[PDB]
């Protein structure tokens, strides 16, 4: 399952290294 919240979580992980 992939949705907008998954993308949001990946972007958080990127901003925090």
């Amino acid at each position, epitope marked *: *399952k*992939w*949705n*907008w*919240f998954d*993308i*949001t*979580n990946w*972007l*958080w992980y*990127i*901003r925090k290294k």
Partner: antibody
Amino acid sequence: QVQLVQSGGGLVKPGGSLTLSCSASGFFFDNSWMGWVRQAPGKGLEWVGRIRRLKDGATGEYGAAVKDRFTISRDDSRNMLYLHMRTLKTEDSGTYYCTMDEGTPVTRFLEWGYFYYYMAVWGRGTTVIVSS
Amino acid sequence: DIQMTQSPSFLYGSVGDRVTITCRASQNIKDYLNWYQQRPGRAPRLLIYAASNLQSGVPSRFSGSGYGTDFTLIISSLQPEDFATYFCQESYSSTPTHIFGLGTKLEKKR
């Protein structure tokens, strides 16, 4: 088309409890956040709460006016959404709408990890009357 | 607490008119704001999300703008099906006592 068939409700005494039901079809229920909004007679909209996917932890989040007394639950195996209410007050009377919710990631770098959230499809509503 | 103030409470217009509905947030909420339409006897529907994005199926005469505290919903060519109640909704935080504006009812002008 997305269908959100609502049931339950009716008359209940102050201090009583009620569960409202929302039967969903026409979309991938398991992959959707869902929520509830209410409207007292002749008044405006008030957010009741939302629930995430099971893979997100099935977390419920609640509006200020109901947090102590309401629970949202979901049964993905039956495409069912529930609102469990206890210790009802006369001011809990009104129309209760279930909602299929959606989001969009914020793409501004400093806001990576936040999202725009909105109630994308609304059910017809269920009437609750809390009265002695 | 974030307070959303919507104006006017009652807006009067004629078919074909351009009308403007305003919503002001008590603090800066950037573009975390949605607009909903509640037509008589029907459940609400989403019009605009994130301040300016039209939901699919929404007619072109609807637009939203604003960033920060002042937001506007504009209907450029009022249709009979647009005589309805409109609500703004902040999506910046889940904790405010009231996340929706109190509503604007669009009525017929005379």
